[PDB]
Amino acid sequence: EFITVARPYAKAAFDFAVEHQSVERWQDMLAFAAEVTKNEQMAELLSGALAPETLAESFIAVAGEQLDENGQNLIRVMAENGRLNALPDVLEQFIHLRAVSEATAEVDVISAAALSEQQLAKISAAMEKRLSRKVKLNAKIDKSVMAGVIIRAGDMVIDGSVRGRLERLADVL
């Protein structure tokens, strides 16, 4: 799992993208790179023991509609170190870094009942009090809560479900 080796490439690529302001374009470039890594015929090649130069240039020939100067050179660095499989994780961490820089957050709202638009509106306002970032609410419907709303801002969770209140009470006794 490449969670720990993806950070340097994500950070460096994001800083360079910021200096040249084409952050959205860089995200497109990385999305394209992540999808070619999932291909059945490429995922076989990436596991073979080819020398980095040959392997990279095959990938670069396949990777049309990227910028030679910058994006394809990121590809070269990752090929040297044998880390092209880190691209599906470098993409996620680049998106995280962008969300942090743009002071914008994505959070999930979960309930057994489909929420009314006024409920979602007040949720967004309250969350923007709790969180400095603006919030994009994601609606998930799950009968598990049985009632109430589960607020899931990533690792930070506020539980407002009856079932949670019940299984919390059961351990008090």
């Binding site: 800083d15 360079f16 050179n73 660095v77």
Partner: protein, 342 residues
């Protein structure tokens, strides 16, 4: 799954331009500092075994050349160094002052005077690491080296050009026997060298005092690497003494070198190795610890007069030179089975 000194601003530099310009291959930057080992990024032209110059007047020896890294050991107080300092590779292997004027002096392993009697009056510089004379350049040992102890001189003869191990436990008289052997050469025409590895400084002061009471000090060179000095200096200390002994050997004179606690050298090379993350071996010693002592002790030779004429460009004719070695080893309760003693 691990990083390899791929870090943010270096990666950003390579992102801007992958085929980064030639610039100078002569220089680089420190990226890590710990326990007297530094990692340097750059130095594309650094040779294995080369001296790297550091800020101030300090040096390091390039021991590991790896894929975009150089591992180097610092030959002095390292804790003042910092990440991001520039470093420049010299063209130089380590060399030490050498000559007749070193007699009667006490010097560190870089040949700097440490007794306070003023600057040296050496006769040029010699490489610390050098190859021994070949098979056809030797001559058989037949002249004696008179120790002065009845038991040794009768039952265990030592000749000019011999390598005689002195081995025993702590506090068994090893140092005393060796230094008495130096004193007996006070009026013998054999120059003496005493190199002390890892010993406490006041013990060296005490033996120099005994060497000064007798007339022996005016005939000997003392090379010191105390317990407070870096492992690189202790590890390199025997070879500098050998390089000073080879001056007399290659010019048709006789010398006697007393390596003291060659074991306290082996510990030093081990420290360097394990800090440089090389594969460990038996008792965690590096695999190439035999090669260390093997290429040190094989310099002790007697060389035929044709080698002396070829070296001195005919200035000295018809005289053989010699270098006699007396290594000292410490046993853990006498077990010869240990790796360094064996």
């Amino acid at each position: 799954q691990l990083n390899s000194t791929e870090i943010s601003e270096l990666i950003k530099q390579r992102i801007a331009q992958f085929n980064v310009v030639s610039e100078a291959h002569n220089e680089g930057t420190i990226v890590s500092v710990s326990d007297g080992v530094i990692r340097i990024h750059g130095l594309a032209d650094a040779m294995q075994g080369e001296m790297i110059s550091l800020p101030g007047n300090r040096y390091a020896i390039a021991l590991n050349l790896e894929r975009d890294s150089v591992g180097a050991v610092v030959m002095g107080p390292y804790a003042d160094l910092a990440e991001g300092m520039k470093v420049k590779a010299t063209g130089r292997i380590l060399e030490v002052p050498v000559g007749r004027g070193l007699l009667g002096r006490v010097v560190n392993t870089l040949g700097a005077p440490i007794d306070g009697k003023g600057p040296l009056d050496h006769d040029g510089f010699s490489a610390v690491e050098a190859i021994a004379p070949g098979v056809i350049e030797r001559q058989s040992v037949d002249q004696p080296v008179q120790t002065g102890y009845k038991a040794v001189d009768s039952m265990i003869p030592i000749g000019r050009g011999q390598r005689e191990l002195i081995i025993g436990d702590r506090q068994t008289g090893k140092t005393a026997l060796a230094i008495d052997a130096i004193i007996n050469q006070r009026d013998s025409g054999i120059k003496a060298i005493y190199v002390a590895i890892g010993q406490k400084a006041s013990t060296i002061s005490n033996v120099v005092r005994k060497l000064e009471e007798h007339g022996a000090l005016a005939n000997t060179i003392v090379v010191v690497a105390t317990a407070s000095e870096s492992a690189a200096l202790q590890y390199l200390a025997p070879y500098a003494g050998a390089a000073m002994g080879e001056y007399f050997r290659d010019r048709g004179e006789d010398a006697l070198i007393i390596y003291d606690d060659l074991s306290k050298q082996a510990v030093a090379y081990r420290q360097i190795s394990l800090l440089l993350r090389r594969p460990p071996g038996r008792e965690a010693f590096p695999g190439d610890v035999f090669y260390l002592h093997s290429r040190l002790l094989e310099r002790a030779a007697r060389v035929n007069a044709e080698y002396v004429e070829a070296f001195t460009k005919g200035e000295v004719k018809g005289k053989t030179g010699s270098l006699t070695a007396l290594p000292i080893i410490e046993t853990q309760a006498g077990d010869v089975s240990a790796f360094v003693p064996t």
